[PDB]
Amino acid sequence: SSKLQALFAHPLYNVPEEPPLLGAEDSLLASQEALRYYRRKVARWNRRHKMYREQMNLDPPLQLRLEASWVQFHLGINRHGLYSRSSPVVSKLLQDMRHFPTISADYSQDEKALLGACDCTQIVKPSGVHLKLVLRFSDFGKAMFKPMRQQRDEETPVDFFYFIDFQRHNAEIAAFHLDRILDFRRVPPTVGRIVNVTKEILEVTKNEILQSVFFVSPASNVCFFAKCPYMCKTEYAVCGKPHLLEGSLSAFLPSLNLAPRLSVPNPWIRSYTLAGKEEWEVNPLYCDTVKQIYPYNNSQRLLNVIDMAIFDFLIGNMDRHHYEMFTKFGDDGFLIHLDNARGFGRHSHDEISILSPLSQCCMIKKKTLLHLQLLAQADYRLSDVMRESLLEDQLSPVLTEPHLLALDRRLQTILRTVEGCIVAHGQQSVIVDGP
Amino acid sequence: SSKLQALFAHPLYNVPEEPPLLGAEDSLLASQEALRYYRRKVARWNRRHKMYREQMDPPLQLRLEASWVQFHLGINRHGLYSRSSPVVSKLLQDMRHFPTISADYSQDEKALLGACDCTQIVKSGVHLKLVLRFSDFGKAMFKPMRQQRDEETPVDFFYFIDFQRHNAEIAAFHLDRILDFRRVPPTVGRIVNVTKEILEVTKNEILQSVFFVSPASNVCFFAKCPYMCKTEYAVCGKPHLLEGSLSAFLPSLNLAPRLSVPNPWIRSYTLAGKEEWEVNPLYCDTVKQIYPYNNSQRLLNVIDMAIFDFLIGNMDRHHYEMFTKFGDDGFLIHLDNARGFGRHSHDEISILSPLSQCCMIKKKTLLHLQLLAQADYRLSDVMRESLLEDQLSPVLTEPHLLALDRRLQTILRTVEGCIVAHGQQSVIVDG
Ligand SMILES: Nc1ncnc2c1ncn2[C@@H]1O[C@H](COP(=O)(O)OP(=O)(O)OP(=O)(O)O)[C@@H](O)[C@H]1O
Ligand SMILES: Nc1ncnc2c1ncn2[C@@H]1O[C@H](COP(=O)(O)OP(=O)(O)OP(=O)(O)O)[C@@H](O)[C@H]1O
Ligand SMILES: *[C@@H]1O[C@H](CO)[C@@H](O[C@@H]2O[C@H](CO)[C@@H](O)[C@H](O)[C@H]2NC(C)=O)[C@H](O)[C@H]1NC(C)=O
Ligand SMILES: *[C@@H]1O[C@H](CO)[C@@H](O[C@@H]2O[C@H](CO)[C@@H](O)[C@H](O)[C@H]2NC(C)=O)[C@H](O)[C@H]1NC(C)=O
Ligand SMILES: *[C@@H]1O[C@H](CO)[C@@H](O)[C@H](O)[C@H]1NC(C)=O
Ligand SMILES: *[C@@H]1O[C@H](CO)[C@@H](O)[C@H](O)[C@H]1NC(C)=O
């Protein structure tokens, strides 16, 4: 039969989560306050669209429809995660980002600043994906489009080979599918899409700078480039073949005006060579100190970081410098796992230093451990349910077989690490229950 | 006598460097082209200053004998400045004493205004730094001392806070000069009247509006977006004076373009047991076959940079910068050393990975390290002596100074390990 279907039909994936949702105070957005904010944005967008049409030389207006996928997605964000388990709203949102036509395109706000005044210090930073764009669909929803990395390192002399995000777009897609399978529900829905850069980007953008950077390749391909990255001799161009370009689309979170977010540094982003001969991943003194440092003094926050370390270890992401949280949900709120483009880069190496929070603190959520133990059994094998889940995406296969099988190998390392913690402290100390 | 004086009088610190400079192609700037560019900027600044003052004095003239002008014209293929340079000595004094005439935000921080997004704010970033311009038209990067405790910055993680930030920029330059790397810009400490020398001289209305008087009757200025993100957001005089670090500006990118290059050893990896990462050569054997590390000079320069970073315990050298004119094999600029001198009781040997994996080192670099390990030229003694010249003396406490001796011994013991495995001929490269 189907292992993915058996997984979500399993009793474990149908246990109600505690404490139950109390409606208002547990939802991220207030429906009436958020809807009138979106209605003002749609009226704003229609005014710009009517005036822009007059400035050039030339359809019915757009209406904010409450039943849109992204609207229900935003209103569905609650204290338990970004989305619900076995959610038909997420399924509809994935299809909508995959098929809906685009109506506008622009740069991301963080890259509109780096249009200068070209300085290679703020351009060659890691984890930064230049040439990415924000697309707006016909239902007014927005997604972050990260195009596939195409240029080899000979075309980018400054880039170091083993740091290039070759798997960049595949990593965003597969990280969401693993998030759903693990039932963390902490990364935004993400799909692959083959995009006509001419029709769905160049012909819909109102940004004159983005219009001017499009050009025709000597091989008769349609391309757009970033000028400042080109001068810094890093990645600067992507091209259709001759029009179609493959990439990843990630659904936008609610506006920071409606839901502010904080960025918090990851205390385990770096490992340290301790004075011999105790190993870093096994020594608990660091976490013993972090446990006494706000906000890691409360149980939920440290357990959430341990969840994030397990997720990062599974995808081999060494670049989680910071994690983000919603302000409304306070310190005990869940962590948002954004920008996973640095994952799934090395299928033949497992960086156990990512697991350091688990191996040092020696505690784990009961829910998290049961899901990992279930995904290690043959009937629910993690590589099988992942491969099956990823067949839904337009860019199937998202992950090759070596990456899928590495998920099973890294899962065994996580469970074998849990065994080590239990030997040293007992199940009562390691396996923490939820309020 | 004086160990610092004995160091620079030693024969080693007076050997002429090969190959000798051939004048034109070895200097960074073309004198006549750069001087007319600076003269246009001074005329521009006088034009901006004449209109601004009318909306509410004799003009400024670009003087060739100014310290920073000779500093810029002195940059050549061998480093940012010359050994035992009286121009550098004058520049350190000028940045310490000259009055300011203008103040503004750094260019990279004018972008984050803002439009507040905490992702681009909590990035090694000093958001309260300012660029000051002196009466001789020279510019310096002012990084104020970190004052706010972590209770006032709920998002900041304690062991990541750059408490030693301003002292680290100063001490990193003094160590750069003592090592004779000559690769970081001259840097001084200064106790700055934030009212007289910043608020009353800036033409940026936003910077004017962020100044306020503390309830404790201190003069402060703050950053709005960092405050909302619950990170470091304010520094204060007591009630006017605030100490910080001043780093001399490099020439304009219009005159001398620079590239940023990722450090291939910024991260360490857990190899399959039980071979250690810093000792296993397979990684550098691969990097040696990857441009531009296939040529000798570039890899040796990175190894120099790793030695420097290990001495100061800087784990945050994600990128290094180079001048475009000098092409490959050019020297590396060691900028923004604010993350150094943070842990005096811990030695992160993974920083030394380029040396311990590649097992090669410059002959010049090794001889300077071997000399600085001897009692008569002890690195901690010459550093402590050198740092007494700064207004914020001692700049470094005793644990940080003594850690320099311990890390120097670790570097030398690593070289011995390389020589045992490959012999002196393979490890010690000549120029
Ligand atoms: N799913 C996501 N993946 C990656 N980054 C995201 C995602 N959602 C939001 N962001 C980040 O948040 C920014 C959008 O923040 P903002 O609050 O401006 O949203 P907005 O809807 O554009 O705001 P406004 O309501 O003013 O138009 C993006 O530039 C991006 O960097
Ligand atoms: N000593 C230094 N330490 C650290 N960073 C520096 C130093 N000198 C220069 N920089 C960096 O290099 C950048 C150079 O900027 P820029 O090219 O605008 O210089 P400029 O002289 O202001 O140029 P312009 O001729 O346009 O005025 C600065 O923004 C600064 O961040
Ligand atoms: C992708 O989009 C482009 C642009 O709309 C399509 O190209 C055009 O349609 C036909 C086919 O060449 C021509 O008569 C038009 O003149 C083209 N327009 C432009 C602006 O070039 C293209 O067909 C789409 N599909 C693919 C697979 O490329
Ligand atoms: C720092 O600078 C301020 C401003 O120049 C000095 O304050 C002034 O002191 C004079 C008398 O010496 C008064 O006439 C002004 O009204 C003061 N201005 C303000 C804003 O208070 C201050 O004395 C300086 N502090 C030093 C040099 O330590
Ligand atoms: C965690 O520590 C903070 C310290 O400010 C305290 O306010 C909070 O009540 C503590 N919570 C728990 C669950 O220990
Ligand atoms: C290193 O490789 C580049 C390009 O592959 C080449 O131009 C250069 O000459 C090589 N280095 C040496 C020392 O030959």
Side-chain angles (χ1 to χ4, degrees):
Chain A
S1 45
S2 163
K3 297 197 178 171
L4 179 63
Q5 255 197 336
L7 180 69
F8 288 95
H10 193 277
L12 189 61
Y13 281 65
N14 296 266
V15 180
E17 296 192 342
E18 309 289 337
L21 298 175
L22 292 324
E25 311 86 352
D26 292 334
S27 273
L28 184 62
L29 304 181
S31 54
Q32 294 315 307
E33 181 189 2
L35 281 172
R36 70 171 51 100
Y37 176 84
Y38 289 148
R39 289 180 197 283
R40 282 191 292 267
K41 281 272 187 177
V42 171
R44 263 183 50 202
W45 193 94
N46 285 325
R47 290 180 61 257
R48 296 205 316 267
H49 195 73
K50 190 180 89 170
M51 284 178 180
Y52 183 85
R53 182 174 181 89
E54 291 178 352
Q55 298 180 348
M56 307 310 297
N57 258 334
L58 249 188
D59 288 9
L62 240 60
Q63 184 105 44
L64 186 269
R65 284 172 296 273
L66 171 65
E67 332 91 347
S69 327
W70 70 271
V71 180
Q72 241 63 224
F73 169 54
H74 288 186
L75 298 173
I77 302 175
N78 53 42
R79 195 172 301 276
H80 281 151
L82 251 34
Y83 54 91
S84 301
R85 187 161 63 207
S86 296
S87 157
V89 178
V90 170
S91 306
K92 183 61 159 41
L93 177 63
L94 301 178
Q95 287 292 332
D96 283 15
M97 294 186 298
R98 185 175 315 166
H99 294 302
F100 277 13
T102 56
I103 62 175
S104 191
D106 207 343
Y107 290 106
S108 44
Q109 231 67 358
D110 63 342
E111 277 162 37
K112 282 174 179 198
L114 313 180
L115 304 170
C118 185
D119 173 44
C120 300
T121 283
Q122 47 188 13
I123 295 296
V124 191
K125 284 185 190 310
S127 63
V129 181
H130 285 277
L131 298 152
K132 73 179 189 288
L133 302 176
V134 34
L135 308 182
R136 176 168 260 110
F137 303 104
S138 43
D139 68 335
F140 206 73
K142 297 198 301 187
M144 184 65 66
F145 178 66
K146 295 187 185 178
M148 172 188 54
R149 161 87 191 214
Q150 305 186 304
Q151 291 175 322
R152 308 177 313 270
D153 53 307
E154 301 83 275
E155 307 174 61
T156 65
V158 116
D159 289 5
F160 184 61
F161 179 78
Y162 297 101
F163 292 168
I164 297 176
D165 51 353
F166 282 119
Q167 283 286 90
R168 156 176 76 205
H169 71 301
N170 294 328
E172 296 285 4
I173 304 166
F176 166 67
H177 287 252
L178 178 58
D179 174 68
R180 184 164 57 177
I181 285 172
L182 292 175
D183 200 43
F184 284 177
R185 309 196 298 281
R186 284 155 206 163
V187 341
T190 302
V191 302
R193 184 166 174 167
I194 301 178
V195 176
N196 191 331
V197 297
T198 310
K199 179 178 182 58
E200 290 173 319
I201 290 177
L202 171 61
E203 293 172 353
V204 302
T205 177
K206 297 177 184 71
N207 186 290
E208 296 180 335
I209 302 173
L210 181 57
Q211 287 170 4
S212 70
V213 302
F214 271 83
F215 66 95
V216 178
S217 168
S220 300
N221 297 318
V222 177
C223 312
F224 74 90
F225 78 106
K227 178 173 185 177
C228 186
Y230 166 76
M231 290 177 165
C232 299
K233 307 188 178 307
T234 182
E235 181 194 1
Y236 68 93
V238 292
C239 300
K241 198 165 297 186
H243 297 281
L244 298 187
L245 168 62
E246 140 176 7
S248 76
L249 276 177
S250 182
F252 256 55
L253 297 179
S255 188
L256 297 172
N257 299 315
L258 292 178
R261 294 187 290 272
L262 295 177
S263 289
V264 185
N266 175 14
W268 285 271
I269 183 54
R270 313 296 272 95
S271 53
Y272 305 93
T273 304
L274 306 179
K277 290 167 186 180
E278 182 77 333
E279 289 296 333
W280 160 255
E281 11 278 316
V282 201
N283 185 276
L285 261 284
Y286 185 63
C287 184
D288 289 328
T289 305
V290 177
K291 282 176 189 197
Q292 303 180 94
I293 295 181
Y294 175 86
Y296 305 100
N297 52 310
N298 48 68
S299 294
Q300 202 60 35
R301 179 64 150 267
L302 189 56
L303 291 175
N304 289 0
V305 172
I306 291 166
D307 273 358
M308 191 181 65
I310 287 170
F311 179 72
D312 291 327
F313 176 68
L314 283 168
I315 73 182
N317 176 31
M318 292 176 66
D319 289 283
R320 188 132 272 151
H321 304 90
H322 293 73
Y323 57 93
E324 295 191 38
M325 309 181 64
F326 290 116
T327 289
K328 186 166 178 291
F329 297 144
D331 303 333
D332 291 335
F334 69 92
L335 314 185
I336 311 166
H337 303 170
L338 298 168
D339 295 313
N340 310 281
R342 314 278 309 172
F344 295 104
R346 292 187 196 92
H347 59 75
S348 52
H349 180 73
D350 303 330
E351 193 37 69
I352 52 175
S353 67
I354 304 173
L355 259 192
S356 290
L358 173 65
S359 48
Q360 292 183 356
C361 309
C362 274
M363 57 188 40
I364 188 174
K365 290 180 192 172
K366 185 178 171 181
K367 181 178 183 293
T368 301
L369 177 57
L370 293 174
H371 284 247
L372 298 173
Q373 288 174 336
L374 186 67
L375 291 166
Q377 292 163 32
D379 286 343
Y380 313 94
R381 184 178 294 112
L382 174 59
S383 59
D384 286 333
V385 296
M386 272 288 290
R387 176 171 41 246
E388 188 172 343
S389 176
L390 290 170
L391 288 174
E392 304 161 2
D393 195 86
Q394 189 178 358
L395 312 174
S396 176
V398 179
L399 297 179
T400 57
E401 286 298 304
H403 288 288
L404 290 165
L405 300 185
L407 287 174
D408 289 337
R409 183 185 66 247
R410 295 169 191 162
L411 174 60
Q412 289 296 326
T413 293
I414 297 170
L415 297 173
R416 188 166 51 253
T417 297
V418 173
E419 287 178 354
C421 282
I422 291 172
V423 166
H425 301 101
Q427 304 197 356
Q428 324 86 354
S429 169
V430 176
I431 309 174
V432 188
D433 289 40
Chain B
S1 45
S2 163
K3 297 196 178 171
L4 180 62
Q5 255 198 337
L7 180 69
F8 288 93
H10 193 277
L12 189 60
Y13 281 65
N14 296 266
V15 179
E17 296 192 342
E18 309 289 337
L21 296 319
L22 293 324
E25 310 86 352
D26 292 334
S27 273
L28 183 61
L29 304 181
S31 54
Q32 293 314 307
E33 181 189 2
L35 281 172
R36 72 171 53 100
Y37 176 83
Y38 288 148
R39 288 181 197 283
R40 284 190 293 267
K41 286 273 186 177
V42 171
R44 262 184 50 202
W45 193 94
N46 286 326
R47 288 177 59 257
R48 296 205 316 266
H49 194 73
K50 190 177 88 171
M51 283 179 180
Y52 182 96
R53 185 170 183 88
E54 288 179 352
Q55 297 180 348
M56 305 309 297
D57 288 10
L60 246 223
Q61 187 68 43
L62 188 269
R63 285 174 297 273
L64 172 65
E65 52 275 346
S67 326
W68 70 271
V69 180
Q70 300 297 307
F71 170 55
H72 288 186
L73 298 173
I75 302 175
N76 53 42
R77 195 172 300 276
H78 281 151
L80 291 176
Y81 55 91
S82 301
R83 187 161 64 242
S84 296
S85 157
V87 179
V88 170
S89 306
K90 184 62 159 41
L91 177 63
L92 301 179
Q93 287 293 332
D94 283 15
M95 294 187 298
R96 185 176 315 166
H97 293 302
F98 278 14
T100 57
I101 62 175
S102 191
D104 207 343
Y105 289 106
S106 171
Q107 196 66 35
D108 64 342
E109 278 160 36
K110 283 174 179 198
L112 315 180
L113 305 170
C116 188
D117 173 44
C118 300
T119 282
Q120 47 188 13
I121 293 295
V122 193
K123 284 185 190 310
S124 62
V126 183
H127 286 276
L128 296 153
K129 72 180 189 288
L130 302 176
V131 38
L132 308 182
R133 177 167 261 147
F134 302 103
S135 43
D136 68 335
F137 207 73
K139 297 197 301 188
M141 183 65 66
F142 178 66
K143 295 187 185 178
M145 172 189 187
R146 161 88 191 214
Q147 304 187 305
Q148 290 176 322
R149 311 177 315 270
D150 52 308
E151 300 83 273
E152 307 174 61
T153 65
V155 134
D156 289 5
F157 185 62
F158 180 78
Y159 296 100
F160 292 168
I161 297 176
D162 51 353
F163 281 121
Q164 283 285 90
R165 156 177 75 206
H166 71 301
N167 294 328
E169 294 284 4
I170 304 166
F173 166 67
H174 287 251
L175 178 58
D176 175 68
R177 183 164 57 177
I178 285 172
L179 292 175
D180 199 43
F181 283 177
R182 303 188 289 111
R183 284 154 206 163
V184 339
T187 301
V188 303
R190 184 166 174 167
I191 301 178
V192 176
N193 191 331
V194 297
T195 311
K196 180 178 183 58
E197 291 172 319
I198 290 177
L199 170 61
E200 293 172 354
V201 302
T202 177
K203 297 177 183 71
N204 185 290
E205 296 180 335
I206 302 173
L207 181 56
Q208 286 170 3
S209 70
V210 302
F211 270 83
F212 67 97
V213 178
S214 168
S217 300
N218 296 318
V219 178
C220 311
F221 75 92
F222 79 107
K224 177 173 185 177
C225 186
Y227 166 76
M228 290 177 289
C229 299
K230 306 188 178 307
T231 183
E232 182 193 2
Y233 67 90
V235 292
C236 300
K238 198 164 297 186
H240 296 281
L241 299 187
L242 168 62
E243 56 175 282
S245 75
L246 276 177
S247 182
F249 255 56
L250 298 179
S252 188
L253 297 172
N254 299 315
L255 293 178
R258 291 182 287 159
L259 296 177
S260 289
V261 185
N263 175 15
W265 286 270
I266 184 54
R267 315 297 273 96
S268 53
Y269 305 92
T270 303
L271 306 180
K274 290 167 186 180
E275 247 281 80
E276 289 297 332
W277 159 255
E278 27 273 314
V279 137
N280 186 277
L282 261 50
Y283 185 63
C284 184
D285 288 328
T286 305
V287 178
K288 282 176 188 198
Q289 303 180 94
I290 295 182
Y291 174 86
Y293 305 100
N294 52 310
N295 47 67
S296 294
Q297 204 61 34
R298 180 65 151 267
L299 189 56
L300 290 176
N301 289 0
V302 172
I303 291 166
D304 272 358
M305 192 181 66
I307 287 170
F308 179 72
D309 290 327
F310 175 67
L311 283 168
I312 73 181
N314 175 31
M315 293 176 66
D316 290 283
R317 187 133 271 152
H318 304 270
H319 294 73
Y320 58 94
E321 295 191 38
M322 308 181 64
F323 291 115
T324 289
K325 184 168 178 186
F326 299 145
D328 304 332
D329 292 335
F331 69 93
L332 314 185
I333 311 166
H334 302 171
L335 247 32
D336 294 314
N337 311 281
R339 315 279 310 172
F341 295 104
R343 293 186 196 91
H344 59 75
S345 52
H346 180 256
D347 303 329
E348 193 37 68
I349 51 176
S350 67
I351 305 173
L352 259 193
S353 289
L355 174 65
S356 49
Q357 291 183 356
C358 309
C359 273
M360 57 187 40
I361 188 175
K362 290 180 192 172
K363 186 178 172 181
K364 181 179 182 293
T365 301
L366 178 57
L367 292 173
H368 285 247
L369 298 173
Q370 288 174 336
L371 186 67
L372 291 166
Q374 292 162 32
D376 286 344
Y377 313 94
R378 183 178 293 111
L379 175 58
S380 60
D381 287 334
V382 296
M383 272 288 290
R384 176 169 41 246
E385 187 172 343
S386 176
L387 290 169
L388 288 174
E389 303 161 2
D390 195 85
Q391 189 177 357
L392 305 27
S393 176
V395 180
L396 296 180
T397 56
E398 286 298 303
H400 289 288
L401 290 165
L402 300 184
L404 286 173
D405 290 338
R406 183 185 66 247
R407 294 170 190 162
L408 175 61
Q409 290 297 327
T410 293
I411 296 170
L412 267 26
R413 189 168 53 253
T414 296
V415 174
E416 287 178 354
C418 283
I419 291 172
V420 166
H422 301 101
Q424 304 197 356
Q425 26 272 353
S426 170
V427 175
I428 308 174
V429 187
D430 290 39

